[PDB]
Design a protein around this ligand. Structure first.
Ligand SMILES: [K+]
Ligand SMILES: [K+]
Ligand SMILES: [K+]
Lengths: 244, 241
């Protein structure tokens, strides 16, 4: 696992700095009405055998949320998880799954992928959802289940959570997460599923505005974890446990 | 499951119930050096396909010293009050294997999932397996069985236990109102837990010593041997789908 070095962190920072201006956070000619399928992608990994991992890509119909495509792949991960560097951990499995989907079911290719974690909501504005979106020329949305703290942007977990609870007291369900250093919205803390109090954090990935991203995440919501994410995570994990 | 099979099972339980020993004899808490666990994981995709697991942990340190899993073919479905006939054969198999491989690790008592004396015919799976194998067993159930014929109702017991908790207690006697006898003990031994588990005497051990041993096996809500047996059985089952 000896991939993370000071020099590797420097290289990763550099690549992120050159990519960040390529991330598009607007819809262009894309709209919610064009979404017929939504994709998911995830990676499960073994703690017993560190090399052993399984990627999974799914496609669900929109808005019915019915799974129409699934594939898992035994993969060897190139670097461990390090916050702010998830992209370098899952870019290759993603590209491989995507290429397989395009060769197998090109007409099921989704108009947008939901990816675990952040997109624009990132210290260098280049989270994994955005990174994978730009490197594959695919529309992506970032959906994170926990909040990343960014001191350099004035984003603190306790403050965001307390602001969101104060919002809930008024009946709201969406809260803009803001960088005080750049005076911009990074993400949206949202609560769409019933019987849920813990928000999830949606950020624009690539080729999609934050607003359209949130609408798509709402349309994908049955429970707290949107369906494409739920399915990719489930099948990747199950296959990993089978071969572990 | 047919009427005749139910009749045969009732008859076997009626014949076994009087062989159950609910006293310690020459056994005491100070003799427990190892505690056994055992469980079976089923697949809902494939009904015959199952995996048994037997574990042995040191006492009171709760350190796992033995584990084994076995692919099993189930003989009958689950039907409440008849759990024993579903797992008697896998248990015996694991037990014999343990005795053959590590005879010096044979435990003085097994914790078994479900009830012992706390049963319509006073012969739950823990007692049944204990007597048919001449081993000391304790019944540990994670949910409450209702026995209307003994006056045991879930809402009443749960409400009684919550009223007890509001006073700081952690043990509630479960009694038959028709036979005027103690059936089980609703207990709370783990910290940060409010949901009781239900301990009944299995075989060759009193209910009071049983509860003492269950307390000794408690780190979290599910006592360690049960937790471990379920853990390994489930993992191995997931390996074979
Ligand atoms: K495959
Ligand atoms: K976490
Ligand atoms: K965390």
């Amino acid at each position: 696992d000896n991939k993370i070095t000071d020099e590797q962190i420097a290289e990763w920072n550099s690549k992120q700095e050159e990519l960040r201006d390529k991330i598009i956070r607007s819809d262009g000619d894309f709209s919610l009405s064009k979404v017929k399928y939504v994709g998911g992608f995830d990676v499960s990994y073994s703690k017993i055998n560190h090399e052993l991992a399984v990627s999974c890509m799914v496609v669900l119909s929109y808005p019915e949320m019915k799974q129409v495509y699934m594939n898992t792949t035994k993969v060897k991960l190139s670097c461990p998880y390090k916050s702010s560097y998830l992209a370098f951990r899952e870019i290759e499995p993603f590209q491989q799954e995507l290429q397989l989907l395009k060769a197998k079911k090109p007409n099921l290719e989704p108009q947008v992928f939901l990816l675990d974690g952040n997109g624009f909501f990132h210290i260098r504005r280049c989270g994994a959802a955005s990174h994978l979106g730009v490197l594959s020329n695919t529309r992506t949305i970032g959906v994170a289940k926990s909040l990343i703290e960014i001191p350099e942007d004035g984003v603190k977990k306790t403050e965001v959570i307390s602001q969101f609870k104060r919002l809930r007291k008024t009946g709201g369900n969406e809260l803009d997460i803001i960088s005080t250093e750049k005076n911009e919205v990074l993400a949206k803390a949202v609560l769409y599923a019933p019987k849920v109090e813990k928000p999830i954090f949606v950020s624009a990935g690539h080729k999609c505005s934050l607003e359209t991203a949130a609408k798509i995440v709402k349309g994908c919501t049955k429970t707290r974890i949107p369906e494409p994410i739920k399915m990719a995570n489930k099948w990747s994990r199950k296959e990993l446990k089978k071969i572990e």
